[PDB]
Design a protein around this ligand. Structure first.
Ligand SMILES: Nc1ncnc2c1ncn2[C@@H]1O[C@H](COP(=O)(O)OP(=O)(O)OP(O)(O)=S)[C@@H](O)[C@H]1O
Ligand SMILES: Nc1ncnc2c1ncn2[C@@H]1O[C@H](COP(=O)(O)OP(=O)(O)OP(O)(O)=S)[C@@H](O)[C@H]1O
Lengths: 565, 565
């Protein structure tokens, strides 16, 4: 932020100077009105009155144009800083590991986004008011000091009361602001989650469930909002009391100083205009009380960004100095728990050969996702390690692991946009020949040409038209187009059996076992065709081998095949 | 609003009267200050000065307490109305058909939510300032009219200029407001999409894609925001010109009327304070012009929410009062396309028997999910119809169809909450015996007891712990707990092969075919295990029968089995 401020120092200087001159001329002109009223009655001058009026009008106009240009500049700078900050936050939250994202929901990050944004705009208008109030405080302080000692005492009392009330209401406001932010976050989150699960609830029939949920959320949010609003109105009332009593005191002391022979009536009116130039600042503080809430929101945003900065330094934490392309993958004495108790791996030792197609068969929940996750460094391992290309996974570059290794998810995600792009996610500037070759190999090419707008059909949230089989085939197409050094596939064949049989035959033919292959499938029948197989049982690896040797082994796999196949 | 007025008329009257009287006393006390400075100081009466000052102070205090209580009440009412409206909108968008959900994305509804909310709060502060401005405008108008003709002319000119500028900037503001709303909505949508697909992006490696995307969205949003802000600053500058020139004119004409013998200096000051009691309205209007944008956004939001409430109960226009329990489901000459071209169903003739299990096997893209949607009345059929229990689906009650028919999805969704509740979605106040029996039958009961907090484990998204097999088993468990008159199951077994195999033996044994069964599975053998089978080929039904008869038929199904089995 400081660097950005430095790169806008000249604009800041222009704004500062313009503000100072504008405020000076403004006070001068209000005192021009004072002298106007004071001179015209004592000396009775019509022409001089007209001329003076014109002059003061001109002064006011110049002041107004200055405040105009200044406000424009400060607004531009403010909004620029806002955009920069928001983008930084979003980017830093994007580069975060799987654990931090899994620990929370979409609603959280989205709520934080919108809230922090609004807080930022509020911060830029607060910024404008801040510049004006600062300059007015300096100028007003000098002018008030010079103009009248007793009036300066009054102004000092007013400023003191204003400050005291403002701070004493400031401390309490931030907390309720945080609470309100939390409530709005929860409500928005429930809204998003309910929106996604629209099909589940519309089909199930439970509308009253989410209705009551949103009712409770809206109720609590309304309660907190009413509390904070009441506090704000209390603050406004107190500051209004200080200001008003300040005015009355100013009028009384003005009359007193007038009749005592200490000051003139024109000095009283001038005291009213310099009162405008001293009280302008405190009113700005009473308006600033709302900015404090935005500042609290900013504290929350910075706390979130501190959290976002966390899992950025862990991706780099293990450093790099390797330049490997594709290695043999072994798991050695692993013992990691993705939770407090009930470890996913109590002991897992596995081995997949370079240039060999491998299959891992286990039911859903056994340990199919964990292997791919551990290889991808999605979830770090607490105890024990793994070896890739004759090197630990910790030392390997995460970007190269990301690009060269492909993971086929059971739940494929497609971001809104053209199908060609959603298919070409990951690798940018990819030749159409490779994408068309992958599409042709994925056996989905027919379902790609069947689309209305060829390849550029709008695909938004599995909409408008989309097949699960075509989707998994598209995932496989992406994995193929990426030219993977390591290929991990879940039970994609299991998603849509018939077309998946053909497309799996085609993909198995295409693979040629030129690289390591992982299977997160439970379908034993589909995995037997593969070259080699590993077995995951009760969180522990049993025996590595082929279907024939494993079945002839007469162990647990043979028991599984006897029990199911 | 009318209903709120009826339920709060006395309070509203109290607030209005309090505002009028308070403002009156304010003007009176301001004229007390006028007479104070002009008469008491000039004629030199100290005691009267002190006493008068005290009195006017008291008047001001009473005014302040009145405005306080009024503002509190109006705030409460405002926020209540806000909550009501928001809840109504969300509820009406929840009860909407599948077509509206498919037509848009989460980002849309979420954006509308947040925007309409902020607009509502803005509407309550605009409401407070509006009440004060109205009452003060009436009193100030009368008093100004009586007090001085020329000053009234000045005030009239000021009000005229204010109104003209305000409207002429008002019309243009709403458009830019709509644009800003659209851009911000797009940004929020990109945010939500990025949030859901976090795993997809972490896996793919493409961070620069969403980074540049959100950068562009933020850029356009910043452009529109800066434009609207510039317009607002222009408005503020113009209104400021009107106000300032109004003041200068007031001072000059005041001096003129003073020296002419038409008015006193005290009459001039009183004219300035009653000017404050007329200008109270114009500052409020200047604040209302910025509020006007929020009001426009609220209007757009109301337009968006008004259109959505249509297709919730008007789609059937046939009434209900039907009491079927469980019927036979047949398809007759159906021809519906869920898109402009490429119809999903060109012709569909089918017949499903009461108390009989049916299985339909087809690849990804054939039309089984579309069929299930048609049975659920999720998507209505353009041409042709379907018959249930000797009655059209159009005439049947959608709620009874919702509760009595259960669909097990291939793509499982889990809403945030306790596992017991997520499992007991749909039917409220369900006995624990039925849920435990369904869990025991779903074979997931073991994986339910394996959980840390038994049944009350937190289930939010795919975190912290969740299995696909356990998920589909949970869907089946929910379907069982609902006590369905019609059971539609997708390839749930195909999601997670092994545990689904055991649980399929147990559940298929459990079903006992006491009701109609639909299959959206592609696994031909597992569906072959079922009682009767239907065939979907190229969007048209071929032949209904059993595996033996269909295979022996030597048609297309036999060709399919030759090609795959
Ligand atoms: N709402 C829709 N509007 C238009 N076309 C659709 C729509 N939903 C699906 N489709 C089309 O129908 C196909 C979707 O296949 P589905 O049968 O619905 O699902 P699926 O891939 O068969 O999943 P399973 O597990 O086999 S039931 C694609 O070819 C789409 O083009
Ligand atoms: N708290 C947790 N955090 C992260 N992962 C977890 C947690 N608890 C369980 N898991 C993992 O979640 C996975 C369950 O994935 P499943 O889908 O049920 O298995 P699967 O065989 O991969 O089925 P598919 O083909 O991937 S759909 C297991 O591999 C567990 O290790």
């Amino acid at each position: 932020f400081a660097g950005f401020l430095k790169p806008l120092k000249k604009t800041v200087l222009c704004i500062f100077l313009a503000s100072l001159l504008y405020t000076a001329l403004g006070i001068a002109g209000s005192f021009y009105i004072k002298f106007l009223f004071d001179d015209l009655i004592k000396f009775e001058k019509l022409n001089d009155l007209h001329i003076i009026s014109a002059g003061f009008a001109v002064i006011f106009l110049l002041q107004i144009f200055l405040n105009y240009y200044r406000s424009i500049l400060v607004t531009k700078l403010g909004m620029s800083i806002d955009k920069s900050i928001m983008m930084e936050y979003y980017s830093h939250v994007l580069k975060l590991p799987m654990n931090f994202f899994n620990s929370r929901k979409v609603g959280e990050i989205i709520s934080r986004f919108m809230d922090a944004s609004k807080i930022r705009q509020a911060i830029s208008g607060a910024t404008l008011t801040i510049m004006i109030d600062t300059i007015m405080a300096v100028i007003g302080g000098i002018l008030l000091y010079i103009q009248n000692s007793s009036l300066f005492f009054i102004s000092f009392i007013i400023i003191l009361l204003y400050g005291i009330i403002v701070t004493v209401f400031n401390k309490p406001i931030q907390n309720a602001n945080r609470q309100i932010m939390e409530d709005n976050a929860k409500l928005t989150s429930a809204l998003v989650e309910s929106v996604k699960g629209i099909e589940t609830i519309k089909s199930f029939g439970a509308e009253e469930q989410t209705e009551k949920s949103t009712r409770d959320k809206i109720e609590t949010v309304m309660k907190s909002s009413f509390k904070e609003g009441m506090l704000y109105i209390n603050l406004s009332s107190l500051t209004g009391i200080v200001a008003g009593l300040g005015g009355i005191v100013i009028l009384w002391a003005g009359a007193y100083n007038v009749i005592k022979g200490n000051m003139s009536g024109g000095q009283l009116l001038a005291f009213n205009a310099l009162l405008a130039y001293f009280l302008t600042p405190v009113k700005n503080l009473i308006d600033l009380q709302p900015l404090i809430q935005t500042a609290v929101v900013a504290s929350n945003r910075l706390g979130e960004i501190l959290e976002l900065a966390t899992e950025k330094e862990l991706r780099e934490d293990s450093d790099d100095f390797v330049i490997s392309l594709k290695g043999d993958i072994e798991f050695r004495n692993v013992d990691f728990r993705y939770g407090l108790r009930k470890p996913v791996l109590k002991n897992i030792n596995l081995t997949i050969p370079k240039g060999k197609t491998v299959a891992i068969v286990g039911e859903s929940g056994s340990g199919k996702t964990t292997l791919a996750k551990l290889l991808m460094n999605f979830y770090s391992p607490e105890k024990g390690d793994i070896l890739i290309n004759g090197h630990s996974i910790k030392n390997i570059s995460l970007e190269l692991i990301r690009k060269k290794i492909a993971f086929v998810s059971q739940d494929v995600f497609i971001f809104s946009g053209t199908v060609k792009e959603n298919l070409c996610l990951g690798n940018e500037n990819v030749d159409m020949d490779e994408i068309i070759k992958a599409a042709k190999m994925a056996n989905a090419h027919d379902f790609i040409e069947k689309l209305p707008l060829k390849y550029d059909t709008f695909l938004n949230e599995s909409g408008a038209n989309l097949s699960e089989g075509q989707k998994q085939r598209l995932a496989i197409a992406r994995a193929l187009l990426k030219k993977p050094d390591i290929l991990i596939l879940d039970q994609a064949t299991s998603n849509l059996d018939s077309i998946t049989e053909n497309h799996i035959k085609d993909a198995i033919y295409g693979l040629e076992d030129d690289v390591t292959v992982i299977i997160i499938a439970h379908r034993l029948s589909t995995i037997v065709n593969c070259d080699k197989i590993y077995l995951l049982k009760d969180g522990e690896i049993v025996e590595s081998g082929s279907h024939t040797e494993l079945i002839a082994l007469k162990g647990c796999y043979f028991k599984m095949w006897k029990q199911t196949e």
